[PDB]
């Protein structure tokens, strides 16, 4: 309640002939972390296979102490020991000031559909946009089939909004963006945006506590 949630999104390029090792090590990491550690709200491993296979792992913790303990616990020590053998390069990480974080408990299946969007808003239009996207993301969570929406701003630059969202199935996601409220939003914010990268992602392993319901005061 009085603690600030920690939301970090890690990404990196996977070596050509190491997809197998990558999947195994990420599965173990997600399973050993959530099964044993405290203060971990959820971990979400996905993959972008377009051009060059990229790993994405969305990690969310209750506070910075929970996070600091995680980086010292066994799951992470084992995984960070394997990254160099399976990573080609890049190795980026976005740290995010969470604006809205809402979820249900996810039991992944073949239909689970994850998307990650990054939106560079023009600084001139940031105030107005913030209130707009906040509303849209809340409307989305109440849509049937939405399992998770994490919305926040990069701590390196608050004009960079980051949206991670999980749906029960691909139809739920398409119905979401073909809805009047979302189409209207695209039209309304068109000239407020500087750049946008949406990445439909291939789910790898997801585990979470569920029931999260947070909003920055």
Coordinates of C-alpha atoms in Angstrom, one line a residue:
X1 CA 0.0 0.0 0.0
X2 CA 2.7 2.5 1.0
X3 CA 5.3 0.7 -1.2
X4 CA 6.1 1.5 -4.8
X5 CA 5.9 -1.5 -7.2
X6 CA 9.0 -2.4 -9.2
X7 CA 8.3 -3.2 -12.8
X8 CA 11.3 -4.1 -15.0
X9 CA 11.2 -5.3 -18.6
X10 CA 14.4 -7.1 -19.7
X11 CA 15.2 -7.9 -23.4
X12 CA 18.0 -9.5 -25.3
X13 CA 18.9 -11.2 -28.6
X14 CA 19.1 -15.0 -28.5
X15 CA 22.1 -16.7 -30.2
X16 CA 21.3 -18.6 -33.4
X17 CA 21.6 -22.2 -32.3
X18 CA 20.6 -21.8 -28.6
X19 CA 16.9 -21.4 -28.6
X20 CA 16.6 -24.7 -26.8
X21 CA 18.9 -23.7 -24.0
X22 CA 17.2 -20.3 -23.9
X23 CA 13.7 -21.8 -23.3
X24 CA 14.9 -24.3 -20.7
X25 CA 16.8 -21.8 -18.7
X26 CA 14.0 -19.2 -18.8
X27 CA 11.4 -21.8 -17.8
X28 CA 13.5 -22.9 -14.8
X29 CA 14.1 -19.2 -13.8
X30 CA 10.4 -18.3 -13.9
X31 CA 9.4 -21.5 -12.1
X32 CA 12.0 -21.4 -9.4
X33 CA 11.5 -17.7 -8.7
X34 CA 7.7 -17.7 -8.3
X35 CA 7.6 -21.1 -6.5
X36 CA 10.0 -20.0 -3.8
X37 CA 10.6 -16.3 -3.4
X38 CA 8.8 -13.5 -1.5
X39 CA 7.5 -10.2 -2.8
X40 CA 7.4 -11.4 -6.4
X41 CA 4.1 -10.4 -8.0
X42 CA 4.7 -12.1 -11.3
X43 CA 7.1 -13.0 -14.1
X44 CA 6.3 -13.2 -17.8
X45 CA 8.7 -14.7 -20.3
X46 CA 7.8 -14.2 -24.0
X47 CA 9.6 -14.1 -27.4
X48 CA 9.7 -12.0 -30.5
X49 CA 10.9 -14.2 -33.4
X50 CA 10.7 -11.6 -36.2
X51 CA 14.1 -10.9 -37.9
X52 CA 16.3 -12.0 -34.9
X53 CA 14.9 -13.9 -31.9
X54 CA 14.5 -11.5 -29.0
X55 CA 13.8 -12.5 -25.4
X56 CA 11.4 -10.4 -23.3
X57 CA 10.9 -10.9 -19.6
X58 CA 8.5 -8.7 -17.7
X59 CA 9.3 -8.9 -13.9
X60 CA 7.2 -7.2 -11.2
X61 CA 7.9 -7.0 -7.5
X62 CA 6.2 -5.6 -4.5
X63 CA 9.1 -3.2 -3.5
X64 CA 12.8 -2.6 -4.0
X65 CA 13.8 -4.9 -1.2
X66 CA 11.9 -7.8 -2.7
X67 CA 13.7 -7.1 -5.9
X68 CA 17.2 -6.7 -4.3
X69 CA 16.7 -10.1 -2.6
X70 CA 15.7 -11.7 -5.8
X71 CA 18.9 -10.5 -7.6
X72 CA 20.8 -12.2 -4.7
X73 CA 18.7 -15.5 -4.5
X74 CA 19.4 -18.8 -6.3
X75 CA 17.0 -18.5 -9.2
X76 CA 18.6 -15.3 -10.5
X77 CA 22.2 -16.3 -9.8
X78 CA 21.7 -19.4 -11.9
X79 CA 20.0 -17.6 -14.8
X80 CA 22.5 -14.7 -14.9
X81 CA 25.2 -17.4 -15.1
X82 CA 23.5 -18.7 -18.3
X83 CA 22.7 -15.5 -20.1
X84 CA 26.2 -15.1 -21.7
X85 CA 26.0 -18.6 -23.2
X86 CA 22.6 -17.9 -24.8
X87 CA 22.7 -14.2 -25.5
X88 CA 24.1 -12.7 -28.7
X89 CA 24.0 -9.0 -27.7
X90 CA 22.0 -5.9 -26.7
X91 CA 20.9 -7.0 -23.1
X92 CA 18.6 -4.0 -22.4
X93 CA 16.3 -3.2 -19.5
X94 CA 13.6 -0.7 -19.0
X95 CA 12.8 0.4 -15.4
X96 CA 9.2 1.6 -15.2
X97 CA 7.2 4.0 -12.9
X98 CA 4.0 2.0 -12.7
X99 CA 0.8 4.1 -13.4
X100 CA -1.6 1.2 -13.6
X101 CA -1.0 -2.5 -12.9
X102 CA -4.0 -4.8 -12.9
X103 CA -4.2 -8.6 -13.4
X104 CA -6.0 -11.9 -12.9
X105 CA -4.1 -15.2 -12.1
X106 CA -2.9 -16.6 -15.4
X107 CA -3.0 -20.3 -16.2
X108 CA -1.1 -20.3 -19.5
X109 CA -2.4 -22.5 -22.3
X110 CA -2.0 -22.6 -26.1
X111 CA -4.3 -19.6 -26.6
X112 CA -2.6 -17.1 -24.1
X113 CA -1.7 -14.0 -26.2
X114 CA 0.8 -11.3 -25.0
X115 CA 1.6 -7.9 -26.5
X116 CA 4.2 -5.3 -25.6
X117 CA 3.9 -1.7 -26.8
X118 CA 6.3 1.3 -26.3
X119 CA 5.0 4.8 -27.2
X120 CA 7.1 7.9 -27.4
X121 CA 4.7 10.8 -26.8
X122 CA 5.6 14.3 -27.8
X123 CA 6.5 16.2 -24.6
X124 CA 4.2 19.0 -25.5
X125 CA 1.2 16.5 -25.5
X126 CA 2.3 14.3 -22.5
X127 CA 0.0 15.7 -19.8
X128 CA -3.2 15.3 -21.9
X129 CA -2.1 11.9 -23.3
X130 CA -1.4 10.5 -19.8
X131 CA -5.0 10.9 -18.7
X132 CA -6.2 9.5 -22.1
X133 CA -4.2 6.3 -22.1
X134 CA -4.9 5.7 -18.4
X135 CA -8.6 5.6 -19.1
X136 CA -8.3 3.4 -22.2
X137 CA -6.1 0.9 -20.4
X138 CA -8.7 0.7 -17.5
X139 CA -11.6 0.2 -20.0
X140 CA -9.5 -2.6 -21.6
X141 CA -9.1 -4.5 -18.3
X142 CA -12.9 -4.6 -17.8
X143 CA -13.2 -6.0 -21.3
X144 CA -14.0 -9.7 -21.3
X145 CA -10.8 -11.8 -22.0
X146 CA -8.3 -9.3 -20.8
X147 CA -6.1 -11.0 -18.2
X148 CA -3.5 -8.3 -17.5
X149 CA -2.6 -4.7 -18.2
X150 CA 0.6 -3.1 -16.9
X151 CA 1.0 0.6 -17.9
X152 CA 3.9 2.8 -16.9
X153 CA 6.5 5.3 -17.9
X154 CA 10.2 4.7 -18.4
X155 CA 12.3 6.2 -15.5
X156 CA 14.9 7.3 -18.1
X157 CA 12.2 9.4 -19.9
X158 CA 8.6 9.9 -18.7
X159 CA 7.4 10.6 -22.3
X160 CA 8.1 6.9 -23.1
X161 CA 5.0 4.9 -22.1
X162 CA 5.3 1.1 -21.8
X163 CA 2.2 -1.2 -22.0
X164 CA 2.3 -4.9 -21.4
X165 CA -0.9 -6.8 -21.8
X166 CA -2.1 -10.4 -21.7
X167 CA -5.3 -11.8 -23.2
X168 CA -7.1 -15.2 -22.9
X169 CA -7.0 -15.6 -26.6
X170 CA -6.1 -13.9 -29.9
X171 CA -9.7 -13.0 -30.6
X172 CA -10.0 -11.1 -27.3
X173 CA -7.1 -8.9 -28.4
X174 CA -8.4 -8.3 -31.9
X175 CA -11.9 -7.4 -30.5
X176 CA -10.2 -5.0 -28.2
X177 CA -8.5 -3.1 -31.0
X178 CA -11.4 -3.2 -33.4
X179 CA -13.7 -1.6 -30.7
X180 CA -15.0 1.9 -31.2
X181 CA -13.3 3.1 -27.9
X182 CA -9.9 2.0 -29.1
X183 CA -10.2 3.1 -32.7
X184 CA -11.4 6.5 -31.5
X185 CA -8.3 6.6 -29.2
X186 CA -5.9 5.9 -32.1
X187 CA -7.5 8.7 -34.1
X188 CA -7.5 11.1 -31.2
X189 CA -3.8 10.6 -30.2
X190 CA -2.4 10.2 -33.7
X191 CA -0.6 13.6 -33.8
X192 CA 0.5 13.4 -30.2
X193 CA 2.8 10.4 -30.8
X194 CA 6.4 10.6 -32.1
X195 CA 6.9 6.8 -32.5
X196 CA 5.4 3.5 -31.7
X197 CA 6.5 -0.1 -31.7
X198 CA 3.9 -2.8 -31.0
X199 CA 5.2 -6.3 -30.6
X200 CA 2.8 -9.3 -30.6
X201 CA 4.7 -11.9 -28.5
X202 CA 5.0 -15.6 -28.4
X203 CA 4.4 -16.7 -24.8
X204 CA 7.1 -18.9 -23.2
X205 CA 6.3 -19.2 -19.4
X206 CA 4.1 -17.1 -17.2
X207 CA 3.5 -17.3 -13.4
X208 CA 1.9 -14.7 -11.2
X209 CA 0.1 -14.3 -7.9
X210 CA -2.9 -12.6 -9.6
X211 CA -5.4 -10.1 -8.3
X212 CA -3.1 -7.1 -8.6
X213 CA -4.9 -3.8 -8.5
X214 CA -2.6 -0.7 -8.4
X215 CA -2.8 2.9 -9.4
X216 CA -0.2 5.6 -8.7
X217 CA -2.1 7.8 -6.0

